[PDB]
Amino acid sequence: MLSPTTAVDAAQQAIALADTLDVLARVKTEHLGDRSPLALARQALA
RNA sequence: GGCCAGGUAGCUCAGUCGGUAUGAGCGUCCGCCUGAAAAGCGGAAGGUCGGCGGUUCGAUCCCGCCCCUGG
Ligand SMILES: [Mg+2]
Numbered sequence: 001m002l003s004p005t006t007a008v009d010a011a012q013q014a015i016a017l018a019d020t021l022d023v024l025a026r027v028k029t030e031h032l033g034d035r036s037p038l039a040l041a042r043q044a045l046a
Numbered sequence: 047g048g049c050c051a052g053g054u055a056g057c058u059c060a061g062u063c064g065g066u067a068u069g070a071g072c073g074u075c076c077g078c079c080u081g082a083a084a085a086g087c088g089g090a091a092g093g094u095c096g097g098c099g100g101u102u103c104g105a106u107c108c109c110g111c112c113c114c115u116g117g
Contacts, residue, residue: 033092042104043066044065
């Protein structure tokens with residue numbers, strides 16, 4: 001599950017839908033950070 | 047300045063010579079619970095790993111200089 005990506009599309013779309021600074025902090029948690037599916041792929045680079 | 051062990055989450059500190067810090071205890075948030083709490087149980091948030099550069103698709107971890115504590 002590495003080939004394209006759709007994770008960037010869902011991240012930038014949720015970023016574009018953040019209305020307040022509180023939503024963007026959650027969007028940064030869901031689509032970035034440790035538990036995000038984007039970084040879960042970087043973990044699978046082992 | 048010399049030589050050195052360090053600087054890692056809000057506090058006090060472990061841990062790692064390339065893709066996860068599974069970080070711990072406590073602090074913060076949610077649920078069950080309570081009139082409202084706390085504990086308990088369950089579920090989460092949060093670190094640019096000292097700064098600035100160097101190498102690599104990728105550096106807290108390797109190279110150089112430097113900031114401050116034990117020296
Ligand atoms: Mg509670």
